[PDB]
Curated annotation (Swiss-Prot), chains A, B:
Residues 1-73 form the Chorismate mutase domain. Its main location: cytoplasm. It is found in: Cytoplasm. The formation of the complex with AroG activates the chorismate mutase activity by more than two orders of magnitude to a catalytic efficiency (kcat/Km) typical for chorismate mutase. This activation is primarily caused by a more than 30-fold-decreased Km value, but also by a four-fold increase in kcat. The activity of the complex is inhibited by phenylalanine and tyrosine by about 70 and 40%, respectively. Homodimer. Interacts with AroG. GO terms for molecular function: chorismate mutase activity. Its EC number is 5.4.99.5. Chorismate binds at R34, V43, E47. It comes from Mycobacterium tuberculosis (strain ATCC 25618 / H37Rv). The keyword Cytoplasm applies. Keywords: Amino-acid biosynthesis, Aromatic amino acid biosynthesis, Cytoplasm, Isomerase. GO terms for biological process: amino acid biosynthetic process; aromatic amino acid family biosynthetic process, prephenate pathway; chorismate metabolic process; salicylic acid biosynthetic process. Changing R34K: It is catalytically catastrophic, but strongly activated by AroG. This is Intracellular chorismate mutase.
């Protein structure tokens, strides 16, 4: 049973890593299109709603959203 | 196009949040079974391999693994 639980963590990490890699590539695409338009970063609106969604995990959820933001350049 | 990219970030965040919530519940299950056996935490072996896997994202990947570990009690 602890074996099968650790195996399930391995699967969840594989999925999370794949999604996070892809979120960074989509974010960098967005940031390139925005910087080619000299557009203003959506820090107070968009990025705050991203943080709010992860905040449901607690304090570590806000820090997680912050890393995801750093990761997306 | 920036609209459709932001929509794809919304989907990736929804998936990541769901997986992270579940990883915390599996981790807490593992930690309960381990503490009921008075077993030694696998800090230097298991948790280091968890950090190594996320390290492929860079430095923010190691911090991400560290949060995932904190999140799983």
């Amino acid at each position: 049973e602890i074996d099968t639980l650790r195996e399930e963590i391995d699967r969840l990490d594989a999925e999370i890593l794949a999604l996070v890699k892809r979120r960074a590539e989509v974010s960098k695409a967005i940031g390139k299109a925005r910087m080619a338009s000299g557009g203003t970063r959506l820090v107070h609106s968009r990025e705050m709603k991203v943080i709010e969604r992860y905040s449901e995990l607690g304090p570590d959820g806000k820090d997680l959203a912050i890393l995801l933001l750093r990761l997306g350049r």
